[PDB]
Design a protein around this ligand. Structure first.
Ligand SMILES: C#CCN1C(=O)[C@@H](C)N(CC#C)c2nc(Nc3cc(F)c(O)c(F)c3)ncc21
Length: 309
């Protein structure tokens, strides 16, 4: 099939993980996750996923899975994203039963950092849940992307026009609960009973939760989105500040503007161009093979692997 022609110039496909395949970037040897979307099946949804790809092009952060490459053919769209070998967050919560308040704080501060940055760029995620949070090789969290009902804010369930920011805060409250308890605050075999439980907003408070844990949950989990704690307050909340003594770092460390000389130098030689020219081209950020190759060289560098293509 011709849809794979251009893609197989850049990557070797491996196992299945939209369909998602593990792949190897030929030039760097770096592993990636490739999301394969078929335009025909998407149909009426196509213009909406196009908007979402453009949102991800505007997100570069230490706690968001990097988009490396976007390729479009007659029938498909390929998104080359970061491979996260540590797995998804709920699998991790299952391995430890539940996290201590301490290890919840480590994890939760990363989640807050990513969400705050998403809101800073003018988006809301709107689908926060453990499945959308993965561990990288450094055991650091990365955010990606009836089934999501358990994490849905009361207003989101009702169909009332929502503010994404307030809905995200509620979802984080649910995540905070799951991290510290190892089960959901609102759960039922019956969908109708789950709807009523979420809109009621009453949940068991286990005996092992500190009063500061319990207060933060009450502030995040408010059925009225107007009474819900704002993101700014969350950044420097006493529970959050504990043991760190500094607010959540939400600002991106991963810049669009700054470049790495070593990676630029290696691409210059390979392209047979100068430093100024190679810098001009890379800073275009077209999310083509160049973008992919540059960002994967930067990852290869961070692991301490050789930079030679
Ligand atoms: C460990 C391990 C392998 N692994 C999994 O077992 C499961 C949880 N998924 C989700 C899927 C499909 C993975 N996703 C990504 N990367 C990714 C990054 C993104 F940004 C995505 O949008 C995406 F779908 C997958 N790497 C690795 C995995």
């Amino acid at each position: 099939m011709k849809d794979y022609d251009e893609l197989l110039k850049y990557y070797e496909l491996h196992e299945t993980i939209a369909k998602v395949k593990l792949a190897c970037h030929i030039l760097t040897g770096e592993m990636v996750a490739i999301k394969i979307m078929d335009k025909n099946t998407l149909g009426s949804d196509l213009p909406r996923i196009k908007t979402e790809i453009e949102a991800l092009k505007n997100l570069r952060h230490q706690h968001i899975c990097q988009l490396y490459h976007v390729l479009e053919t007659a029938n498909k769209i390929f998104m080359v994203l970061e491979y996260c070998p540590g797995g998804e967050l709920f699998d991790y919560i299952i391995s430890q039963d539940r996290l201590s308040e301490e290890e919840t704080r480590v994890v939760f501060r990363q989640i807050v950092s990513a969400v705050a940055y998403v809101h800073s760029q003018g988006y809301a995620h709107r689908d926060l849940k453990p499945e959308n949070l993965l561990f990288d090789e450094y055991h650091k969290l990365k955010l990606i992307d009836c089934g999501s009902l358990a994490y849905a804010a009361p207003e989101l369930i009702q169909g009332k026009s929502y503010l994404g920011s307030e809905a995200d805060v509620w979802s984080m409250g649910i995540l905070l609960y799951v991290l510290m308890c190892g089960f959901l605050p609102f759960d039922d075999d019956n969908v109708m009973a789950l709807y009523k439980k979420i809109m009621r907003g009453k949940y068991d408070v286990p005996k092992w939760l500190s009063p500061s844990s319990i207060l933060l949950l009450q502030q995040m989990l408010q059925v009225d989105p107007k009474k819900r704690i704002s993101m700014k307050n969350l950044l420097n909340h006493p529970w959050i500040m504990q043991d760190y003594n500094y607010p959540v770092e939400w600002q991106s460390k991963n810049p669009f503007i700054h470049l790495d000389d070593d990676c630029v130098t290696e691409l210059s030689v390979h392209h047979r161009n100068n430093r100024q020219t190679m810098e001009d081209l890379i800073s275009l950020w077209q999310y083509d093979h160049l973008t992919a190759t540059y960002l994967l060289l930067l990852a290869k560098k961070a692991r301490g692997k050789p930079v030679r293509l």
